[PDB]
């Protein structure tokens, strides 16, 4: 309700591997750069040129914004520093760059690097700095049990690559968006050359399905409607012929 | 690297993951393809899951591809059979049942074939009954 997340917000694109979390975060950042604004990507497991090449498959051209200076791609590894040094470098770059949108992908990388209490401290400090400076933050996360990091974030988008009958169908949930009204429905996020496209659910018996299951239910309903109409015609013809029989008996 | 699980099973998590990240970085910097066989998965640009599952008292061999950053990889789980001629991958039977991809695939083939034969025999029996009832009606009319 209202057209998207609040500007001053902490978003959590969580998922399993292969769920397009980095892709959705890249879309956020490219939108920031398209509105005339200025944005940062903080990749902790991928290269900048690799990212440009890979997202050009989904249709984004992050290279234009990078060249324009509206996109800064900072690639650093979780183990090449101390988590405190990571915090310091990130804060310094963000300060000099004065962004509007900041992506951290994946924040799961800063886990084994340090004690978990210190991990929560680092993440909370980052979140607080971004919010307090009024910067939209996107935080990608990798995994179904308990994470605990969702409370610090104000928006939760859950991406899922689910195996259904030997096929990995892609689903997107908007689990939480504090201070707003949002759909409690499972949209189907299709990755394609044009981009990421969320398709609406199939409302009816059995749920949304959202995939080859949707096609199966649609085909079942189709065949069943044809069966019903054929039965209706059969019974109408039986009635008509029995009526002919009785009228002829009356004539006899 | 067959297998990288050897390092992990024993070493400290941070240390072993640091070594792994370093190896990957060096290989990519020198422009070298890197296969890593494993018995954690986001540091890789492609991920192939191999499975030897149990189905009705018989183990079956299924391969599929659940990651590939800059490409479009099929979301289907194909059946991989190993043999002297080589390693082969057979597509799944689409439609009812999903994929099965095993001796249960052979069983579904057999069941659908049996049901088609049954449909044909029963439509034939109905045709024969209809013809016989038509002959009965003709005879009664002549009477």
């Amino acid at each position: 309700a209202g057209g998207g997340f609040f500007r001053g917000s902490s978003i959590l694109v969580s998922g399993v591997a292969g769920a397009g979390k980095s892709s959705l975060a890249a879309h956020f950042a490219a939108a920031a750069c398209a509105r005339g604004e200025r944005a940062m990507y903080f990749s902790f497991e991928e290269a900048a040129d690799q990212a440009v090449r890979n997202m050009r498959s989904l249709g984004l051209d992050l290279g234009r914004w990078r060249d324009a200076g509206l996109l800064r791609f900072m690639a650093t590894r979780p183990t090449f520093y101390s988590l405190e040094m990571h915090l310091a470098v990130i804060l310094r770059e963000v300060m000099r760059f004065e962004p509007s949108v900041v992506v951290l992908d994946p924040i799961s990388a800063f886990t084994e690097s340090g004690d978990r209490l210190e991990v929560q401290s680092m993440l909370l400090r980052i979140v607080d700095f971004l919010k307090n400076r009024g910067i939209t933050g996107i935080f990608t996360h990798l995994a179904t049990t308990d994470a605990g990091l969702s409370s610090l974030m104000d928006g939760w988008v859950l991406m899922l690559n689910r195996e259904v009958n030997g096929e990995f169908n892609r689903e997107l949930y908007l689990l939480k968006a504090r201070g707003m009204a949002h759909s409690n429905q499972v949209r189907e996020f299709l990755m394609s050359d044009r981009g990421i496209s969320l398709l609406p659910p199939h409302l009816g018996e059995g749920g949304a399905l959202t995939g080859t299951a949707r096609k199966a239910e649609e085909a079942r309903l189709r065949r069943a409607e044809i069966e019903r109409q054929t039965e209706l015609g059969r019974l109408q013809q039986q009635i008509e012929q029995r009526r002919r029989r009785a009228r002829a008996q009356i004539e006899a | 690297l067959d297998p990288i699980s050897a390092f992990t099973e024993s070493g400290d998590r941070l240390e072993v993951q640091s070594m792994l990240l370093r190896i990957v970085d060096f290989l990519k910097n020198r422009g070298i393809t890197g296969i890593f066989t494993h018995l954690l998965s986001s540091l890789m640009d492609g991920w192939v899951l191999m499975l030897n599952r149990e189905v009705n008292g018989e183990f079956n061999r299924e391969l599929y591809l659940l990651k590939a950053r800059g490409m479009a990889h099929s979301n289907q789980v194909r059946e991989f059979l190993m043999s002297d001629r080589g390693i082969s991958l057979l597509p799944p039977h689409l439609g009812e049942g999903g994929a099965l991809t095993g001796t249960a695939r052979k069983a579904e083939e057999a069941r659908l074939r049996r049901a088609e034969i049954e449909r044909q025999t029963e439509l034939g029996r109905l045709q024969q009954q209809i013809e016989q009832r038509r002959r009965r009606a003709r005879a009664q009319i002549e009477a």
Partner: peptide, 21 residues
């Protein structure tokens, strides 16, 4: 008689369809 025969034919087709169901 002929019309009853036709109706019986239709009923048999309907039974085949129901079995399909």
């Amino acid at each position: 008689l002929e019309a009853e025969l036709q109706a019986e034919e239709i009923a048999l087709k309907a039974l085949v369809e129901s079995e399909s169901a």
